């Protein structure tokens, strides 16, 4: 029940980048390589949920203004169309998946806090037991660009070829980041969003709060986490017109000790990193 | 008569990524890009062909020693096993492909000569009009880990959009390179080898020559000049049963001001680099 | 029967300043409460962290009281 | 070959400022992490920056931190420093590093910053 | 941070002979180290990585070992082309990153 048993690196490279798509996560499975004797959507959206407008055209109206100007008895109200120039006000039809907050984890640990937050700071629910919330709903790994950062418990995190049982370091074993879920789902260790706590008035002002986690409401398109070569298990070809060309998993050109994906000089076959399936795209 | 013509870069991605297979190039072909108005081998050998052996076991003999030591009179014959210590001497079936010699020219300009031989140090052939051998017999660009050299005449370079028409910049042009070939063919800028020119006695020493140009013999092979996106014109599947996974070609993952192979702010569409035919794997 | 996948066990390794560290062990028998599991049920609900932790902010949690 | 070659001015006044660039080739830019190292005259070398290789996260030395910004290209292929303010203090010979293993883009990068290839170093002197 | 300490201010021996030099340093480095060589006017070269791990382009003969808070590097068999200060640095933690004061020889 591990894609490595069924597919090869090249059958799995073949199979990720020319399509579209095709029990509790215990060791036991056949081994990856053969000789070893032992004891689906797949697309990355190219538009992101809150870009799908025309850029060109104006739309319905917003509230620019509540007063004014700086000074006593300034209340008003004013409104303004919706268009090209501000984008973030437009009426949108859709809006982002469910989202469970996860406490943010920096690799470089000076970034980190002197604390122990392994087990007190992380996510968790009850059942009179309290249990972690791992790998949990399905959400960016992390705000575009951010690498170094990964969800405390939202993860799947393999271990490379060799690695101890206990209290190895972070290079030792592989964390995978969903980086592609971000068009359609909010950050795993970023809030959902806003709302109002209060009713304002004249003596009182507009107050609001942080919605940590939010469950389903109408109009929540989402992706799932994709599945990895060394994942749990348990063919549609690609159409697309898009012009430019794709970006595909591949292999480097670089002189090296070992070649990846093969055995050493002491016969032990390793996986370098984890592959996961998204690498053509869609529109959203 | 231009490949760009008959495919989009998306298309010509699908081609060479999962195919082993498939009139003086001037001016005014249809244009890359619809909207604008105007006026064969697909592999790299995994093997070279002087390691085509077994490495594990022995083979025939090869004249080892023609000496015992040093001093007077000491001539002998001793022979060994051409064998997996010593894989230069081995005995083959074939040859690598014919030459005939470039000018070697390196992209750092400062250890270039400081001397005018763009013309002059050029390989030719006369007909009594003498005419630059552009680009000549197809072989490899540069050796092993070299790539800031190339040929003189010896490959097809491809202006940048925009590069005008007379002594424009290096950087304003696209260089190619067939490094893809160096398995089966010679070096472009290195000699083919070595010929005894004399016969050897008590009195002569064995001398050499080298070869600065060959013609076909038999046992010899050769590949063919790759095909480019932007090159002149005039499917069969992968089979392999490789394990590590290929190279493919892949657009760049990071973020950039505008994308390649589309068009910019001012409506202008470019090809930024050439695209050979050459990146799956089969066995020489 | 171990699982495959790994937490996060010892962010610090000891007492005092500067003592950030990102350890990681396997789940299995011994600990079971942070194997990651692929279905979660539908007292509070549980924990969701309200802020990022940073070298002077502690990660703080918070109570969820209700959950669709 | 991983040829590093970086350009700089020589001299400024105090309080003022400066564009580093750093144009790399040989290797492929966008793979590996950059940084700039620092040493003065007849002293050993100083850390001042980092750069990640997609070049969203960047490090700072407390001395240099908030004065400097490090700045990547990729597709230009360049390595920018961007230096203001400057004190006598700065004078020293700046290097341009490159950062030994690649960032991954599946897994969750872990930085190790030990060095493979560096550059011959321009001479920033601020004095008046 | 973290403050490296490397032991041997100059260290003047003779070529052919097997050179021992040191550097320590506070709390734990783990194994995360790297050691470095300068020659005057000239770009530092990496000589090892991790605690023994020789880089690619190193001869054989340069070979070092630690761990914790203190590390040796061992020249077996000097010559002249191998004279120049040497540093030592920690990435383990970081930033900001640190370099050794240096060992001439």
């Known amino acids: 029940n591990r894609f490595h048993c069924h597919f090869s690196p090249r059958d799995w490279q073949r199979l990720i980048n020319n399509n579209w798509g095709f029990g509790s996560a215990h060791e036991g499975c056949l081994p990856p390589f053969p000789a070893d004797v032992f004891m689906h959507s797949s697309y990355a959206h190219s538009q992101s949920l809150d870009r799908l407008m025309n850029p060109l055209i104006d739309q319905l109206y917003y509230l620019s203004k509540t007063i004014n100007g700086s000074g006593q008895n300034q209340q008003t109200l004013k409104f303004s169309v919706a268009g090209p120039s501000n984008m973030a006000v437009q009426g949108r039809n859709y809006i982002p998946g469910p989202s469970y907050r996860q406490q943010r984890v920096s690799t470089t640990v000076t970034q980190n806090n002197n604390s122990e937050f392994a087990w007190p700071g992380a996510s968790s629910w009850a059942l009179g037991r309290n249990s972690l919330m791992n790998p949990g709903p399905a959400m960016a790994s992390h705000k575009e660009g951010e690498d170094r950062f990964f969800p405390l418990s939202g993860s799947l995190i393999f271990g490379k070829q060799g690695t101890g049982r206990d209290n190895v370091d972070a290079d030792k074993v592989m964390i995978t980041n969903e980086e592609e879920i971000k068009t359609t789902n909010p950050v795993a260790t970023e809030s959902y969003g806003q709302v109002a706590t209060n009713h304002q008035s004249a003596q009182a002002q507009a107050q609001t709060g942080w919605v940590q986690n939010q469950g389903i409401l109408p109009g929540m398109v989402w992706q799932d986490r994709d599945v990895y070569l060394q994942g749990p298990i348990w063919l549609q070809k690609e159409n697309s017109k898009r012009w430019n060309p794709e970006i595909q998993y591949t292999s480097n050109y670089y002189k090296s000790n070992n070649v990846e994906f093969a055995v050493n000089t002491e016969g032990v076959y390793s996986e370098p990193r984890p592959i996961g399936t998204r690498y053509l795209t869609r529109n959203l | 008569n231009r490949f760009h013509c008959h495919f989009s870069p998306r298309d010509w991605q699908r081609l060479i990524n999962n195919n082993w297979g498939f009139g003086s190039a001037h001016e005014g072909c249809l244009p890359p890009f619809p909207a604008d108005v105007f006026m064969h081998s697909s592999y790299a050998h995994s093997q070279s062909l002087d390691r085509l052996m077994n490495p594990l076991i022995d083979q025939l003999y090869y004249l080892s020693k023609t000496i015992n030591g040093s001093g007077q009179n000491q001539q002998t014959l001793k022979f060994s096993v051409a064998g997996p210590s010593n894989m230069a001497v081995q005995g083959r079936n074939y040859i690598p492909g014919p030459s005939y010699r470039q000018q070697r020219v390196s992209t750092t300009v400062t250890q270039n000569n400081n001397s005018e031989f763009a013309w002059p140090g050029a390989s030719s052939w006369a007909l009594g009009r003498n005419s630059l051998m552009n680009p000549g017999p197809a072989m490899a660009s540069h050796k092993e880990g070299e790539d800031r050299f190339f040929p003189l005449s010896g490959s097809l370079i491809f202006g940048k959009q925009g590069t005008g028409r007379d002594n424009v910049d290096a950087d304003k042009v696209m260089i190619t390179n067939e490094e893809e070939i160096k398995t089966t063919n010679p070096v472009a800028t290195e000699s083919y080898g070595q010929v005894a020119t004399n016969h050897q006695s008590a009195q002569a020493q064995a001398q050499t020559g080298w070869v600065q140009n060959q013609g076909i013999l038999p046992g010899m092979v050769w590949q063919d000049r790759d095909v480019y996106l932007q090159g002149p014109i005039w499917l069969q599947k992968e089979n392999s049963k490789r394990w590590n996974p290929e190279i493919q070609y892949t657009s760049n993952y990071y973020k950039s001001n505008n994308v390649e192979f589309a068009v910019n702010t001012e409506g202008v569409y470019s090809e930024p680099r050439p695209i050979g035919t050459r990146y799956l794997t089969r066995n020489l | 029967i171990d699982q495959y996948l790994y937490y996060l066990s010892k962010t610090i390794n000891g007492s005092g300043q500067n003592q950030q560290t990102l350890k990681f062990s396997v789940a299995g028998p011994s600990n079971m409460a942070v194997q990651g599991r692929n279905y979660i049920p539908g007292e509070s609900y549980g924990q969701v962290a309200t802020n990022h932790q940073s070298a002077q902010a502690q990660a703080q949690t918070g109570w969820v009281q209700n959950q669709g | 070959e991983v040829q590093l070659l970086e350009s700089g001015g020589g001299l400024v006044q105090p309080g003022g400022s400066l564009r580093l660039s750093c144009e790399a080739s040989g290797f492929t830019f966008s793979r590996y992490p950059m940084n700039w190292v620092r040493q003065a005259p007849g002293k050993g070398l100083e850390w001042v920056s980092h750069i990640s290789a997609s070049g969203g996260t960047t490090y700072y030395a407390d001395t240099v931190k908030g004065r400097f910004s490090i700045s990547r290209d990729n597709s230009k292929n360049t390595l920018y420093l961007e230096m203001n303010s400057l004190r006598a203090e700065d004078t020293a010979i700046y290097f341009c590093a490159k950062d030994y293993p690649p960032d991954e883009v599946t897994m969750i990068v872990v930085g190790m910053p030990y060095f493979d290839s560096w550059g011959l170093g321009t001479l920033v002197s601020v004095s008046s | 941070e973290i403050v490296m300490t490397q032991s041997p201010a100059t260290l003047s021996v003779s070529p052919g002979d097997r050179a021992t030099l040191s550097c320590r340093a506070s709390?734990?480095?783990?194994?995360?180290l790297a050691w470095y060589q300068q020659k005057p006017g000239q770009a530092p070269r990496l000589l090892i990585y991790?605690?023994?791990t020789r880089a690619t382009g190193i001869p054989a003969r340069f070979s070092g070992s630690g761990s914790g808070t203190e590390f040796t590097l061992t020249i077996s068999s000097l010559q002249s082309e191998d004279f120049a200060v040497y540093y030592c640095q920690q990435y383990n933690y970081w930033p900001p990153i640190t370099f050794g004061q240096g060992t001439r020889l």
């Open positions: 709390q734990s480095v783990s194994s995360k």
């Open positions: 991790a605690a023994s």
